[PDB]
Design brief:
By secondary structure, the protein is mainly beta. The protein has one helix at residues 88-93, and strands spanning 3-13, 19-27, 30-33, 37-40, 44-54, 63-71, 78-86, 95-103, 109-122. The strands form 2 sheets. Strands 2, 3, 4, 6 and 7 form a 5-stranded antiparallel β-sheet that branches. The protein is globular, with a radius of gyration of 15 Å. Bound molecules: magnesium ion. The PDB classes it as membrane protein.
Length: 126
């Protein structure tokens, strides 16, 4: 039927210290935020699914971006790291399991890692 990009953000691990955490996911300029996970130490089990209806099709070149922040209600969000992927493998195989490290604002690899599944599929389950 009509297709969608579906992103199941599972866990973010090897976090530093203790903080409320929040995730931001973006595709084609449309962003969603996860719920805030309060008082989280080294692993944030977001376990949240995000959906982008796609009117026509997705090209190999398009990018999915994930950003993870330290949240506090009276302060601006503080960026921890970013993950980007091109969607070539997702478009080809319909489903891709991601397990990888985040990148900081100087292109350096940090220990904080991300676990998620990315799908391109019929919205209705088929
Ligand atoms: Mg969910």
């Amino acid at each position: 039927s009509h297709m969608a990009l579906i992103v199941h953000l599972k866990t973010v691990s090897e976090l530093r210290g203790r903080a409320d955490r929040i995730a931001k996911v973006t595709f084609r300029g449309q962003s969603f935020y996860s719920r805030v996970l309060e008082n989280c130490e080294d692993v944030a089990d977001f376990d949240e699914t995000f959906r982008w209806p796609v009117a026509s099709s997705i090209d190999r070149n398009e990018v999915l971006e994930i950003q993870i922040f330290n949240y506090s209600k009276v302060f601006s969000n503080k960026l921890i790291g970013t993950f980007r992927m091109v969607l070539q493998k997702v478009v080809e195989e319909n489903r891709v399991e991601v397990s990888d490290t985040l990148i900081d604002d100087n292109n350096a690899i940090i220990k904080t890692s991300l676990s998620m599944e990315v799908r391109y599929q019929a919205a209705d389950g088929t």
